Symmetry: C2
Subunit: 233 residues, 2 copies
Amino acid sequence: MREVKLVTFDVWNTLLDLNIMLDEFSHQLAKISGLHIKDVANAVIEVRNEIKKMRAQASEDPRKVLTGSQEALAGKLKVDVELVKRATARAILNVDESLVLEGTKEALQFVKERGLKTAVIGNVMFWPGSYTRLLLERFGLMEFIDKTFFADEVLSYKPRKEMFEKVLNSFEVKPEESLHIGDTYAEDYQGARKVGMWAVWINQEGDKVRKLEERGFEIPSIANLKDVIELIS
Amino acid sequence: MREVKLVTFDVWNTLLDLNIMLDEFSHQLAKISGLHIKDVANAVIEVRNEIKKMRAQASEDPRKVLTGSQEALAGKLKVDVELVKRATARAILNVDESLVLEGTKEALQFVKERGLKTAVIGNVMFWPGSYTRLLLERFGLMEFIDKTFFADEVLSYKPRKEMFEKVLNSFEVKPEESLHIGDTYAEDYQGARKVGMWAVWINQEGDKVRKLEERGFEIPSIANLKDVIELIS
Ligand SMILES: [Cl-]
Ligand SMILES: [Cl-]
Ligand SMILES: [Mg+2]
């Protein structure tokens, strides 16, 4: 088979811890809005469930990949969307290194040491891709990332076809010469799989590396990415 | 004369020091690129001026401004546009409160305690409007700003008439009940005045508060904003 030249990474729940970030955000939004933390925490889950359900079917207008979530949240809580934007800014300044998931920097180093190209393909919600890029840069991860592709900056989102192809084209590689790893089945796995790339789904509820189908695997943690990479090299 | 209900604010060189930022940015960009700061500073200057001119020509695309400035800089230096994006994240991480211009907090506080609404109206270049919002938030200034209207988010730019009108329609006030202060004569001053608002041009080389004309003022720094405010009240 063709040799893998590019490994692409999802961010939330693959490299960084999403719940800590979402909790810091709910907290910060509740603080500046003077609202009860439970109402804010619930609104966040509702907006996230809704958009996740839409994105799986490519039903959200990519032009609102960011603004949509922000305005939906603002409306649920009856506040100016300006407060939502400010809350994300404060949350990004309040989180820290505890956000980095175990084995993350090691897996990135493994890829870069084999001479492979790396990239980040992440969707966005509530806060722009620029905020997430700030975190990657701040935790030293960007040292191992060659290119970053955030939904709001590319005007698309996983599992949409043009989102992955944009990345493949940027590195001038073919789908079969690429592998994408992410934790959202409907977004990362199916997205990369139907474009032709090798796909790896992180299922923390899993125990071992499993071949799910042709060009598709399931692994318990990013720590096992090196096993999949080595298996197909 | 109608009483002023809204005071709008330019950001760079009005509230925050743009020299310090551009310098931190040029240093970070030169650092990750392996180029001399001089090379980078010149490219920044060249892009900065060429963009200013296009705005004077009212022939700039509000939706491409940010990416344009980054692609223009990346091309002048012959680097991947990714290094430009990383540099803005790194600069934002390496700057501090020394970025706040003297008297900014007091000036903002004076306007707020006066019971007036406030807003930020700024153009974007090199780093997204969101990074600018992050710093204002980080330095405690967003506490005195009710709304933000950035070119990359609102899809318009000063001195264009629609940019100022968006803010007027947002706060639902007449041009005569608004005062805009900024340090760029063509973008801030002439743009605000042609729309009918009170306009204050910050001129550092200035020595005292000066009435430039009907609804037009010139002051050396934001520390004298209150003088104009109380003057027309
Ligand atoms: Cl805080
Ligand atoms: Cl590096
Ligand atoms: Mg993500």
